[PDB]
Amino acid sequence: MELWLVRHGETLWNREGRLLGWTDLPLTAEGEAQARRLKGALPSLPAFSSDLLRARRTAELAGFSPRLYPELREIHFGALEGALHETLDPRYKEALLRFQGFHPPGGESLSAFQERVFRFLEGLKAPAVLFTHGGVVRAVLRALGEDGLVPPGSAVAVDWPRRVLVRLAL
Amino acid sequence: MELWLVRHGETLWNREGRLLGWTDLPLTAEGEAQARRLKGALPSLPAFSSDLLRARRTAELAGFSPRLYPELREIHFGALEGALHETLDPRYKEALLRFQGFHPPGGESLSAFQERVFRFLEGLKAPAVLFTHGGVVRAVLRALGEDGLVPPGSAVAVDWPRRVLVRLALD
């Protein structure tokens, strides 16, 4: 079943290199421009979106009116929200790289995060466009055996749960 | 899974251009003619149909004895029921055109409509013929990435939830 995973436009923490999870940052001017460009590429399928501002605004600027689901949120980094990726304790860097064994204080475990994301995905009953976050897109791509890193404001279409259909980066 | 969806025959509000949702209108003479032409053109599979008259009657004239399900009904337009499409406020016109963010007072939102329709399709265990409405066919075709408008009394076959197989219209 066709699903479009869209990573929201950039926020200030993207250029700053800070972990961005449940901190509700707005899009930058460029992030808004990225969202607008998506209007000319994304298919008009039922839309869903993380309830965080940056995702909602990306959906809006891309020409969609999404049903909001917190299950589509990026992982909650807890005390690590806003932390510079460069200064993270090696244990955290390692976990984020290998995509396993990550449980920030006051946040969600990478395991609970994935459980939340896939429960949502398996619940879908028709093709859809999903406005979400880098970590969510990464989880889905890795589940299909692919590298999950995609730029802000870009998207990847997948034939869930079989394979990746195409990547779209502007 | 192979599913055949049939848009019921025309009613007076088709030529009139009025939003027809849960208003239970009958088929016109031409509407019955369209339904009769479907007999012998649709596959022999279990049949399901919206419980609204126009749909049930289409199924009947097409040679089927479907189990009735309100879940196959057209979207509930609420206060907009019977409204001339031509005179709808821009917000509603655009919402229906772009098939998104439609919240009619006293009716069903497009999101609620889609959830209802898709939940029903998910429950189907095997191939079947579904006698339904223009909006339902439109939601399905659009979800499959194609233009969703089809003529009254016409049908489409899809491999749900993957692709459209064929569109069938008769004269």
Side-chain angles (χ1 to χ4, degrees):
Chain A
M1 191 169 78
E2 190 166 325
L3 302 180
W4 284 73
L5 282 289
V6 187
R7 185 181 173 187
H8 65 71
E10 67 146 48
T11 67
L12 283 179
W13 282 5
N14 176 61
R15 63 181 64 169
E16 280 178 49
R18 296 180 179 280
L19 298 190
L20 176 62
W22 286 16
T23 301
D24 201 36
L25 295 189
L27 295 173
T28 60
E30 184 50 38
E32 293 189 303
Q34 298 177 323
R36 292 196 182 85
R37 282 194 280 284
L38 288 167
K39 189 176 176 178
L42 300 180
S44 51
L45 315 179
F48 294 87
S49 173
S50 155
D51 61 317
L52 296 170
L53 176 61
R54 59 195 185 274
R56 290 187 289 106
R57 182 63 170 166
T58 294
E60 179 176 54
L61 292 175
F64 295 80
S65 302
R67 289 166 59 178
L68 306 183
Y69 280 78
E71 294 91 324
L72 282 174
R73 288 191 180 192
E74 172 64 82
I75 181 171
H76 181 22
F77 290 111
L80 292 185
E81 286 287 331
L84 278 171
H85 189 292
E86 175 184 296
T87 64
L88 286 172
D89 180 302
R91 64 170 179 172
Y92 291 133
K93 289 183 182 180
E94 184 59 46
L96 293 182
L97 176 65
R98 64 181 184 180
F99 211 65
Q100 177 183 49
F102 181 67
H103 199 335
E108 286 180 305
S109 58
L110 189 67
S111 181
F113 166 61
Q114 293 199 288
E115 197 281 353
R116 159 158 79 64
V117 175
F118 292 107
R119 177 177 68 246
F120 175 77
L121 297 176
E122 305 323 305
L124 291 171
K125 303 173 179 56
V129 173
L130 314 175
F131 288 93
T132 184
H133 309 260
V136 175
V137 176
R138 188 179 177 191
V140 174
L141 285 174
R142 292 181 61 85
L144 298 175
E146 310 271 43
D147 183 297
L149 305 178
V150 304
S154 68
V156 295
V158 305
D159 174 9
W160 187 256
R162 308 185 182 190
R163 53 184 282 275
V164 172
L165 289 167
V166 69
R167 299 201 188 201
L168 176 66
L170 309 176
Chain B
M1 188 182 283
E2 188 180 332
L3 294 182
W4 288 66
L5 295 88
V6 183
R7 182 183 176 190
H8 65 72
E10 68 157 57
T11 67
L12 287 176
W13 283 6
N14 185 58
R15 68 187 65 175
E16 288 188 52
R18 287 179 184 284
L19 291 181
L20 179 61
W22 289 11
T23 294
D24 199 38
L25 292 186
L27 293 173
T28 64
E30 179 56 52
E32 297 190 309
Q34 305 174 323
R36 297 207 188 76
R37 284 193 285 282
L38 290 175
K39 185 180 180 179
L42 298 171
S44 299
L45 294 169
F48 296 95
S49 172
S50 161
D51 61 312
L52 296 174
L53 180 67
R54 57 194 191 273
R56 292 188 294 88
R57 177 66 173 170
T58 293
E60 182 186 305
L61 292 172
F64 293 80
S65 299
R67 181 174 186 172
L68 307 183
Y69 277 102
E71 294 90 317
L72 279 173
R73 287 188 178 191
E74 173 63 79
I75 188 171
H76 180 24
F77 288 111
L80 295 184
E81 284 287 333
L84 277 173
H85 185 290
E86 163 198 59
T87 62
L88 289 176
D89 295 315
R91 57 174 177 170
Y92 294 131
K93 266 212 185 74
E94 185 179 61
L96 292 176
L97 179 61
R98 296 179 63 73
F99 216 63
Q100 66 179 186
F102 180 60
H103 304 86
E108 277 188 304
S109 67
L110 196 66
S111 293
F113 173 60
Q114 283 167 151
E115 176 168 40
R116 163 159 74 73
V117 172
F118 302 146
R119 183 185 297 290
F120 178 79
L121 298 185
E122 175 201 295
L124 296 167
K125 301 306 182 300
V129 177
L130 315 179
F131 287 91
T132 184
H133 307 261
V136 174
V137 174
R138 186 181 181 197
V140 172
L141 292 183
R142 285 187 66 91
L144 296 179
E146 309 198 344
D147 183 77
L149 311 186
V150 302
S154 75
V156 299
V158 304
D159 171 15
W160 186 254
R162 301 181 67 73
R163 61 160 292 177
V164 179
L165 299 170
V166 67
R167 297 198 186 204
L168 173 64
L170 300 170
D171 287 0

